[PDB]
Amino acid sequence: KETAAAKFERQHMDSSTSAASSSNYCNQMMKSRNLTKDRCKPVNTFVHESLADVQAVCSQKNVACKNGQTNCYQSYSTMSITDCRETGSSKYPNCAYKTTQANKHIIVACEGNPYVPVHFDASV
Amino acid sequence: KETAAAKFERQHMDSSTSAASSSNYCNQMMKSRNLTKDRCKPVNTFVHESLADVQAVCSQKNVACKNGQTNCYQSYSTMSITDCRETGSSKYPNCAYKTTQANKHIIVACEGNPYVPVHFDASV
Ligand SMILES: O[C@@H]1CO[C@@H]2OCC[C@@H]21
Ligand SMILES: O[C@@H]1CO[C@@H]2OCC[C@@H]21
Ligand SMILES: O[C@@H]1CO[C@@H]2OCC[C@@H]21
Ligand SMILES: O[C@@H]1CO[C@@H]2OCC[C@@H]21
Ligand SMILES: O[C@@H]1CO[C@@H]2OCC[C@@H]21
Ligand SMILES: O[C@@H]1CO[C@@H]2OCC[C@@H]21
Ligand SMILES: O[C@@H]1CO[C@@H]2OCC[C@@H]21
Ligand SMILES: O[C@@H]1CO[C@@H]2OCC[C@@H]21
Ligand SMILES: O[C@@H]1CO[C@@H]2OCC[C@@H]21
Ligand SMILES: O[C@@H]1CO[C@@H]2OCC[C@@H]21
Ligand SMILES: O[C@@H]1CO[C@@H]2OCC[C@@H]21
Ligand SMILES: O[C@@H]1CO[C@@H]2OCC[C@@H]21
Ligand SMILES: O[C@@H]1CO[C@@H]2OCC[C@@H]21
Ligand SMILES: O[C@@H]1CO[C@@H]2OCC[C@@H]21
Ligand SMILES: O[C@@H]1CO[C@@H]2OCC[C@@H]21
Ligand SMILES: O[C@@H]1CO[C@@H]2OCC[C@@H]21
Ligand SMILES: O[C@@H]1CO[C@@H]2OCC[C@@H]21
Ligand SMILES: O[C@@H]1CO[C@@H]2OCC[C@@H]21
């Protein structure tokens, strides 16, 4: 199995590009990151910043997670992100995603020692 | 009990202002909209557009909800919104919220006849 931290990296980190390259970005990334393997993951966000910048969020603004847990953190600054969301004719195993690029604060849940992101809660 | 539609209006509609008026906007609105009555609701978004503009989202871009349901819709345009999130010393019944104003697409789940918003899924 993956560690929680490694799974966060796989699902949510894209430090290789400053933003989505095209309207097919999500189709490509959801597939290559193994998020369409056993089902179509309905919604997923990729962050276009360094791993260090995203891990740093765990020592930024402490806020409540959507479920009421206390280990969530909101980035002080906005970050380049891409929201990927299933759309239209999407039906496993023929997944299809809408790509929406934006610049927003991210909110992540952190755990462990070292204290690192393990869930993407939301973006604002 | 409230209808689902009326509950959405109570939790999520603020057509009276173009944006959050101050850093205390969320403290005021979470209280006056009864979201701190029996507990501190951890996270909640208010939309600063007409009720008609928000209801109109139900006939815009059909996308998957975070849970995989198919009745979610993403606004074609961005809208003025305020994210309210519990912060710091927040402990029922002394709720405390961080106010973050932004301009984003909204995603809502719709139901019924007439087909209207019943849940706020996310914003991008
Ligand atoms: O390293 C960071 C991660 O993504 C940004 O755009 C390209 C490089 C920048
Ligand atoms: O808007 C985002 C922020 O930085 C990226 O470079 C091109 C656009 C991307
Ligand atoms: O097309 C836009 C412009 O720059 C971004 O980096 C990858 C492609 C994005
Ligand atoms: O960054 C966004 C994502 O895809 C669009 O087409 C290229 C740039 C636009
Ligand atoms: O374009 C890419 C290539 O393969 C992905 O699955 C469908 C289309 C996606
Ligand atoms: O699919 C997208 C398109 O550009 C990114 O770099 C590698 C693949 C990524
Ligand atoms: O918080 C983590 C710990 O190491 C990274 O470099 C700076 C911040 C990142
Ligand atoms: O409530 C506080 C907020 O962050 C600390 O670490 C986890 C919970 C502790
Ligand atoms: O975390 C979820 C995934 O997509 C949504 O956009 C903002 C955050 C929401
Ligand atoms: O009616 C709409 C709802 O909120 C906007 O700013 C004030 C009026 C506008
Ligand atoms: O940014 C939002 C969009 O419209 C509002 O008027 C003042 C700022 C508010
Ligand atoms: O202060 C800003 C400027 O205009 C917005 O409408 C209410 C207050 C907001
Ligand atoms: O709109 C945002 C929300 O609160 C800030 O102070 C007033 C305007 C700023
Ligand atoms: O400022 C307002 C007034 O009452 C709310 O609960 C705490 C503070 C909030
Ligand atoms: O609390 C906020 C401050 O301004 C809005 O109009 C009525 C109260 C709302
Ligand atoms: O979709 C709903 C139905 O009535 C409202 O006025 C236009 C759109 C709104
Ligand atoms: O799958 C489609 C998408 O919208 C229709 O109404 C509910 C589900 C139907
Ligand atoms: O719906 C939730 C509530 O707050 C988050 O900001 C974007 C949407 C997320």
UniProtKB/Swiss-Prot annotation, chains A, B:
Entry EC number(s): 4.6.1.18
Molecular function, one GO term: ribonuclease A activity
Catalytic reaction equation(s): an [RNA] containing cytidine + H2O = an [RNA]-3'-cytidine-3'-phosphate + a 5'-hydroxy-ribonucleotide-3'-[RNA]; an [RNA] containing uridine + H2O = an [RNA]-3'-uridine-3'-phosphate + a 5'-hydroxy-ribonucleotide-3'-[RNA]
Tissue expression: Pancreas.
Source domain of life: Eukaryota
Glycosylated position list: 1, 7, 34, 37, 41
Keyword Magnesium: no
Residue positions binding substrate: 7, 10, 41-45, 66, 85
Keyword vocabulary terms for this entry: Disulfide bond, Endonuclease, Glycation, Glycoprotein, Hydrolase, Lyase, Nuclease, Secreted, Signal
Active site residues according to the UniProt entry: 12 (proton acceptor), 119 (proton donor)
Class of the enzyme per the UniProt entry, highest EC level: lyase
Record bears the keyword Transmembrane helix: no
Cystine pairs: 26-84, 40-95, 58-110, 65-72
CC terms in the record's Gene Ontology section: extracellular region
Cell compartment(s), UniProt: Secreted
Biological process per Gene Ontology, one example term: defense response to Gram-positive bacterium
Subunit structure: Interacts with and forms tight 1:1 complexes with RNH1. Dimerization of two such complexes may occur. Interaction with RNH1 inhibits this protein. Monomer.
Purpose of the protein: Endonuclease that catalyzes the cleavage of RNA on the 3' side of pyrimidine nucleotides. Acts on single-stranded and double-stranded RNA.
Family statement drawn from the similarity comment of this UniProt entry: Belongs to the pancreatic ribonuclease family.
Protein name (record): Ribonuclease pancreatic
Organism from which the protein derives: Bos taurus
GN (gene name): RNASE1
Parent-protein residues present: 27 to 150 of 150
